[PDB]
Subunit: 349 residues, 4 copies
């Protein structure tokens, strides 16, 4: 009896446990956005490490939607060989391969975090002409053709992702990037049908979700990651998230990946173990939409407990899998579950 | 920001953190129910260990309500000097002293667990003439005068506890003992006003809660511990617990301590970390009564997460404090919280 | 097969395991040096925690030999009732009671560490008129009658300790206190028979060891604690410790407790797990005298390994038992050894 | 101050820390002994995991010297491309690549451990016609031409290893395989110059060591792994190991890797944390030959402690790196050492 290691039915899939690798940018792609040797070592290692699902890092649906010049990309058919080999190796190592589709919006074009992370001066786009912070380029507000172009890029990115062998698609609608910035009034001050009211701010994000859902068969889960709150005064709140989650549920979205923050910088975030679990909890229990919990989950007993409480269906792990890629194998034993480990390693367990 | 070590306002008290020592029978009293040297070492150790609240083990309100011949008792003024010294030493070591008033019902009169735990053949009482299991005496069904006698014993037990300096009173209405056995239909098959319907099965337990609430001033929390489910087919369920909780809330009970099981033996209990947290979560969120979570909570991150999720207001620890009495001190440091340790020990932290 | 939990024959005793509580000043005695309620809780807690031996903190053989005005003392028959109760409670909780006899020398008369730790200006004594550091009183150099007086105080302290029921006696000859300061040339610049050469600097410490050995029966181990090095240029070194150890062995000392430092302040101490184990290892293997290892031992595997290596016969734990008094109970389980825990606690293991 | 993470000078190299990956057969080579995708994921993962040195698994110097049909081989120039890519990837991931050269001797030709491990009936060779156990083929005793052939195979294997880019060579002279079986009298009952006396039994093993040393430049360390004891009555003992180690030292061997057992089955091995550390300790301190310690080392504090004690120069880790490949990165932090982690992972530390 450990829910953490009990299969999870999502869409038409059965994940072998409730542990997923959270998407984590590695900033190690080529300038063309191609998979490199780094990702082919990085991701299969965690697959052997025991997660039932790996969500590959934010992958830009167009070059202007990248965070860094070394982000993975999926805007071109020439990304398919590298991406396909990535999903193959993840699957061969025992995990279901998924990928997060993303568009950095007004936060596009920054240096690698360990190279300063400074803006590069790209012609970034967003809902309204408001820069992210000091020194960031002023985003060019999108017109209806621009939004349609990016929507089609998300659609083609999903089609490409499926051709590559990925079986879970997450739309990155969080952390102050393009679609997250349309939701929040701190970054969306538009006066047309796509800003102002809650219904208007959700309009373009829900169009993208609907369009992608239509090209992803029901058997393959479609995730949506959101910042359940932007932690800003008068900004996007949990009640807004619940309203947004109800609409995603009606469109056929399979699971809401509940993160927070990122819309603006100078806001206090009450960091603590499980500090975003209440967001996954509220959505799941008040809307009826499956949720993924993420945020300072580092312990087997902690992960099992939030599942026991009904706060989420899926536990996503980020930083603990950077420093302990085999955490799932050893977590099973910690919970009294015989770990399914590679035969080459059975003598180590 | 670690909710686990943020003070908790309960009634007129401020507990210095959200950690409590769960009531744990020691089977080390005298034959007259007196505090001994064992308790005077056992409990202060855990108060120095850093819990904000210590719930002293099940203390019998009448001799026939004891589990073992070596249970703590509170049926006599003769118990007051030892209980007063116990509360003084707990408080001297930094924790708020509390105590669980109990009546073992049809499970009364068994040997110490490490001495066979076999029934002793007492003239035990219960709701219905049904033995707990093979070899147990058949309970004598209580009449209305008998229930009133035990109710008054709970009232006098509470008054005595307060004179002794205890500031939190918990009523043991869980684990198949007297009041638990009235709640569950597996043990209560009465056809009068105190069995059959849910309202009838709650009647005597609620009468006790109200009578005790009347003699416990508002500043001092009144807890009630319940088996949120008995895990038996057609037995006491979470929905029943919610109904029971709404009635306790109206009576002025401060907090529901959510355990499970113990009513009958041959039931499958899905043990796992936090497996009883969903019961505290449901009561808290759907009734609005504060709850205490307990059951295989062993880790600081796990305990912090369930508080961040809103599943409980208080985390109760049992077995982890038997093997690791200073867990709270080291748990603070693990959460980035400067521990408030005895000056004699600062060099160890 | 876990040497850590294999009995240890010392003198006429059998310690039930190779774990001991290292002596740790509590600064909680009365102004007359009496045992208080603090010690009576502090020490039995660790005996229940599973150590086979408890060495009670440095206990001053004369008022002027105290570190603080709140040190334990043993210079009076008036100390016997409290010390006897301390040993009884330690033994009642399963551990052999031992005690460290001490004389603070030129570091005598300082405030409690959490009360500034500043010197109080006592008429302290030492080998040479050299203050420990800025602000400390200049020690009055002892004459032969003065050393004989302190030697007799150590003898009467040992006799008193034995009457109180202590079964292991350790002589504190480390950490810059009186006898340590005679050993080290950084504190001892005498030109008579008790300074200069190594033989001269060992003379008074060895006289004390021999005098105490004479009044401690062979069945009860006599320990000596030493700073195996003072970490100062041209100071007391490991080779000196080996010479000192050979002399202690010939006198009948049972075990050398190998610490370091404390003679002067401005020295670089290479702190790291097990950093003093090489000193216990060298003494044990090159002199053949049993040794106790101490210093940043915090883990069962670490403690078991140094015993498997033959670096020591006894593992002494200090600060880890301040924050985790039940470490030995949980350490047994971690080494595949069924722990022998109080029956009241079996359900926690 | 953590010796575990202080550079180690060996031969002409400087390893960046004192942690090495012990050689661990993966049984995942082709039937031709070629490196496969498994090793190219398995080994670089541990290199990123932080070890300063990786000793690649037992690699057979001739097909008959293999343990399984899926062992790595080095008997052919066609092994060089795969082996060279393996060492390149290890080095690119930050670790020095080394390789263990081996000959299974009378234990050659067994199935994979997770496929029964049963003998296959190969024409195995050994010192004397004594089978390993029931069902094992009777080894054909080597003649002087056969020993010379295997010696030359070790020499050519070393030359090939160096051509491939390996900078540390270990000769596998332990665990009852060919050269280990020449040392022990349980398996060597020869009546010529290569059995009987200690000098005779060491003869062929020392010829191999000398021959390999001559083709490995002094700048590149040459290790020799031995079973310091066979745990058998009248068998190879620690005193024999010391005599053998003195001769290896005079030949120019850089480090003795101290294991145990494997010569025969039915012997009791006192398994415990650090149980082979006393062998590395005795060799290092009584012979003056650098040693590697291995055997149930799982903890940073444990590893640091045996280095502090002078029991070994190098800590080798086996099974802990199968279940926790990034142990070295997290061990550094546990010891107060800023870990050198890949920039992509800095946010996880
Ligand atoms: C290096 C790094 C890269 C990340 N990249 C992404 C990303 O591309 N998309 C995303 O939604 N979240 C990203 N995150 C956030 C994590 O996915 C996760 O939501 C967050 O770090 C909290 O989870 P954790 O505490 O387990 O790490 C990243 C985090 C880190 C540390
Ligand atoms: C030895 C022992 C005695 C206990 N005594 C009581 C008790 O007297 N009253 C009660 O309500 N629960 C009692 N319990 C149950 C615990 O208080 C707690 O609810 C349960 O053990 C689950 O919490 P845990 O996993 O942290 O131990 C006892 C448990 C143990 C192991
Ligand atoms: C509060 C405290 C009091 C101590 N008192 C003594 C003492 O009275 N006599 C002594 O020889 N060592 C004393 N020590 C040193 C310890 O006994 C022990 O040798 C040292 O702390 C290193 O061991 P550890 O790392 O396990 O704590 C004391 C240490 C502390 C932290
Ligand atoms: C799967 C496995 C394969 C091993 N292969 C080898 C080997 O090829 N050569 C060798 O000398 N030791 C081998 N060993 C023994 C280890 O290298 C190591 O000496 C031993 O397991 C004790 O170290 P540990 O407790 O850290 O695992 C192997 C051990 C395991 C579990």
């Amino acid at each position: 009896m450990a829910l953490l290691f009990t299969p999870l039915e999502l869409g038409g899939l059965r994940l072998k446990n409730r542990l997923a690798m959270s998407p984590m940018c590695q900033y190690s792609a080529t300038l063309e956005g191609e998979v490199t040797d780094w990702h082919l070592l990085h991701y299969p290692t965690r697959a052997l490490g025991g997660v039932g699902l790996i969500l590959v890092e934010a992958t830009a649906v167009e070059p202007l939607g990248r965070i860094s010049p070394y982000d993975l990309g999926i805007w071109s058919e020439d990304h398919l060989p590298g991406l396909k080999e990535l999903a193959r190796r993840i699957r061969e190592a025992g995990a279901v391969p998924g990928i997060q589709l993303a568009h950095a919006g007004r936060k596009a074009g920054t240096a690698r975090p360990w190279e300063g992370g400074k803006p590069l001066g790209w012609r970034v786009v967003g809902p309204s002409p408001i820069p992210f912070d000091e020194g960031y380029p002023v985003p060019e507000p999108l017109d209806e053709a621009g939004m349609e172009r990016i929507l089609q890029a998300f659609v083609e990115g999903a089609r490409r992702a499926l051709r590559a062998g990925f079986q879970v698609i997450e739309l990155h609608m969080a952390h102050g990037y393009l679609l997250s910035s349309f939701l929040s009034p701190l970054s969306n001050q538009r006066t047309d049908a796509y800003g102002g009211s809650l219904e208007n701010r959700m309009r373009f994000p829900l169009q993208v979700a609907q369009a992608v859902r239509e090209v992803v068969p029901r058997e393959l889960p479609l995730f949506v990651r959101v910042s359940a709150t932007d932690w800003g005064e008068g900004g996007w709140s949990l009640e807004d998230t619940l309203a947004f989650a109800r609409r995603l549920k009606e469109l056929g979205v399979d699971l809401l990946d509940c993160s927070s923050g990122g819309v603006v910088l100078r806001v206090r975030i009450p960091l603590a173990p499980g500090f975003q679990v209440p967001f996954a909890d509220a959505v799941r229990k008040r809307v009826g939409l499956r949720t993924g919990a993420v945020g300072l989950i580092t312990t087997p007993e902690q992960a099992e407990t939030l599942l026991q409480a009904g706060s989420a269906d899926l536990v996503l792990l980020g930083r603990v899998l950077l420093r302990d890629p085999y955490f799932p194998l050893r977590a099973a034993k910690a919970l009294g579950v015989a770990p399914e480990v590679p035969p080459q390693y059975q003598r180590g367990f």
